T-cell receptor, first 199, second 242 residues
Framework: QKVQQSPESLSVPEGGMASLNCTSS?????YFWWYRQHSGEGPKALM?????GDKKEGRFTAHLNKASLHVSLHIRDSQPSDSALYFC???????????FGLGTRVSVFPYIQNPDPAVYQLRDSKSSDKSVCLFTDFDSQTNVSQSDSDVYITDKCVLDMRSMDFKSNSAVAWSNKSDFACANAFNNSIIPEDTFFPS | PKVLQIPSHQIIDMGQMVTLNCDPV?????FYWYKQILGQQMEFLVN????????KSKLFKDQFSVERPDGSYFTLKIQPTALEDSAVYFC????????????FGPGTRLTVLEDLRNVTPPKVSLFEPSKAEISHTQKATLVCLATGFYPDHVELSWWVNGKEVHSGVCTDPQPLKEQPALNDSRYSLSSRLRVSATFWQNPRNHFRCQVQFYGLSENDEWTQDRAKPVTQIVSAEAWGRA
C-alpha cells in the first residue's frame, strides 16, 4: 500500500469538524489529491495539493508537508451531504493513473434533540402473519449490533423529514425463528433502559 | 461537465465478452479505466491517449481490449469474463493529462456468475405503520422489505400518490446476505418511509414501495419452469387508513 490513510472511518456531528490524514511510503509520489465518493457514484475531486502549506476550498482545507510526506484534509461545519468515502490519491512527478489510499468513510450524524427510543412491531399489509421490528428514535451514538444466522438486523439508517426539520435513526429486524420477538430482537445491542416497548 | 457510463449494471456468466462504455468530457484527451473492489479499494487499470493504450497496471490483463473509435464511446471489453472480474469499473478523463483533475463516470457494476440459473427477482412486502408509533409520536413509519433476490442489483424507490418521494426516506446502503455462509447467497434489502401520522391516516393517500431489479434479457435463454427472472419492477402498495 503506497498511499496510507487514517482513520479507517469517522463519525462527525452535523456542524462539526473532521481531520483525515494521509501519507505515502514512496517519496516519488509527492502530488496529492483528495477525492470524495458518494454511494453509487464515482469519485469527485475536492482539491489538489501539490505544494507545502495550506489550501482552502469552501469548508475544506488541505495541508501538505513534503519533507515528511504528510497530507491531510480538514472539514469544517460538516453537512449531511459530506457523508462519503474520502480518498487520498497521489501521482508521481512524471500521464499516469492515480494511486489511491483505502479511503476514510465519514458519517455525519444528526444531534437527536429529544430522543425517544422505541421498538415497534409492524404487520405486513397483505398478510397479518408476517412482521418486522422497527428500532427507532434512538440517539445517534447508539450502536446497533448485527447478530443468529436466521435473524436479520439492518444497520441504523438516518431519514430526514425535510419540511419538518426532523431527523431520526432507525434499524429494522426480522426473522422466522420461533423464539424471535421484538422484545428480544435487538438484545445483542446496548439500548437505553427507558426504551419504549409497547403492545 | 460529467463523464457518463453505460450500462449501470451488467450480469454475465463466465467465458463471455462484455463491453463497458464510457462517454468522456467532450474536449478531454486522456481516458482512464479503474476498478473498485468491494466498494472501497480503487485500482488503476489502463489509460488511453493519442488513440492508443499507453500506461497499464499489473491488474490490466492485456487480453482485454481498449478502444475509442472516431465518434464512438471509450470502451473496455472484458473477455473471457471470469468470477474475479466482478467489480465496479469506473472510467475517467482529463484535459491536461497526469496532473489534471480526473473526472469520473458513475461506474458500471459488473457481476460475473458461474451460471445464470440462480438469477432471482425480489419479493417485496410493505409493512404498515404501528398504531403505537402513531400514538406515541404523531408519526408513521412504513417499512419495505425486498427479499430473496440474486445477484444484488436493485434500486428501491417510494411513490406517494403517483409521485416519487425522497424526503422521509432512508434505504439500507447495502443489501444483506441471507445466508452469509454461502458464496451464492441471496440478498435482502430494507427501506423506511416516515410521514406525519395524519398523512398516513388519510385514506386518499396511496403509498408504494418499488424495487427496480436488474436481471436477464430477452437475449438470454430460459428453460426452467419458474418465470424468466428478467429485468423488472416488483412493488408493494397500500392506502392510508384511520
Amino acid at each position: 500500500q503506497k498511499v496510507q490513510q487514517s482513520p479507517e472511518s469517522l463519525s462527525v456531528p452535523e456542524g462539526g469538524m473532521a481531520s483525515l490524514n494521509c501519507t505515502s511510503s514512496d517519496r516519488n509520489f509527492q502530488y496529492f489529491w483528495w477525492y470524495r465518493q458518494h454511494s453509487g457514484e464515482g469519485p469527485k475531486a475536492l482539491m489538489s495539493i501539490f505544494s507545502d502549506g495550506d489550501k482552502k476550498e469552501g469548508r475544506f482545507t488541505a495541508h501538505l508537508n513534503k519533507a515528511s510526506l504528510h497530507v491531510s484534509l480538514h472539514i469544517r461545519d460538516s453537512q449531511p451531504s459530506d457523508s462519503a468515502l474520502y480518498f487520498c490519491a497521489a501521482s508521481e512527478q512524471n500521464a499516469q493513473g492515480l494511486t489511491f489510499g483505502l479511503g476514510t468513510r465519514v458519517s455525519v450524524f444528526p444531534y437527536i434533540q429529544n430522543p425517544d427510543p422505541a421498538v415497534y412491531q409492524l404487520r405486513d399489509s397483505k398478510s397479518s402473519d408476517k412482521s418486522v421490528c422497527l428500532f427507532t428514535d434512538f440517539d445517534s451514538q447508539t450502536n446497533v449490533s448485527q447478530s443468529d444466522s436466521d435473524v436479520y438486523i439492518t444497520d441504523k439508517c438516518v431519514l430526514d423529514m425535510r419540511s419538518m426539520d426532523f431527523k431520526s435513526n432507525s434499524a429494522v429486524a426480522w426473522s422466522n425463528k420461533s423464539d424471535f420477538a421484538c422484545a428480544n430482537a435487538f438484545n445483542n445491542s446496548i439500548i437505553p433502559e427507558d426504551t419504549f416497548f409497547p403492545s | 461537465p460529467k463523464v457518463l457510463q453505460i450500462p449501470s449494471h451488467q450480469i454475465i456468466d463466465m467465458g463471455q465478452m462484455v463491453t463497458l462504455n464510457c462517454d468522456p468530457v467532450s474536449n478531454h484527451l486522456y481516458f482512464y479505466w479503474y476498478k473498485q473492489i468491494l466498494g472501497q479499494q480503487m485500482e488503476f487499470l489502463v489509460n488511453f491517449y493519442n488513440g492508443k493504450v499507453m500506461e497499464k497496471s499489473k491488474l490490466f490483463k492485456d487480453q482485454f481490449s481498449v478502444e475509442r473509435p472516431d465518434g464512438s464511446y471509450f470502451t473496455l471489453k472484458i473477455q473471457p469474463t471470469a468470477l474475479e472480474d466482478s467489480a465496479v469499473y469506473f472510467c475517467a478523463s482529463s484535459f491536461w493529462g497526469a496532473y489534471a483533475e480526473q473526472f469520473f463516470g458513475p461506474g458500471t457494476r459488473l457481476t460475473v456468475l458461474e451460471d445464470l440459473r440462480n438469477v432471482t427477482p425480489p419479493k417485496v412486502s410493505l409493512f404498515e405503520p404501528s398504531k403505537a408509533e402513531i400514538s406515541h409520536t404523531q408519526k408513521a413509519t412504513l417499512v419495505c422489505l425486498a427479499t430473496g433476490f440474486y445477484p444484488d442489483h436493485v434500486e428501491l424507490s417510494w411513490w406517494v400518490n403517483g409521485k416519487e418521494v425522497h424526503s422521509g426516506v432512508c434505504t439500507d446502503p447495502q443489501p444483506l446476505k441471507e445466508q452469509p455462509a454461502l458464496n451464492d447467497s441471496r440478498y435482502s434489502l430494507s427501506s423506511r418511509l416516515r410521514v406525519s401520522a395524519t398523512f398516513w391516516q388519510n385514506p386518499r393517500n396511496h403509498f408504494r414501495c418499488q424495487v427496480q431489479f436488474y436481471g436477464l434479457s430477452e437475449n438470454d435463454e430460459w428453460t426452467q419452469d419458474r418465470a424468466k427472472p428478467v429485468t423488472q419492477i416488483v412493488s408493494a402498495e397500500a392506502w392510508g387508513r384511520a
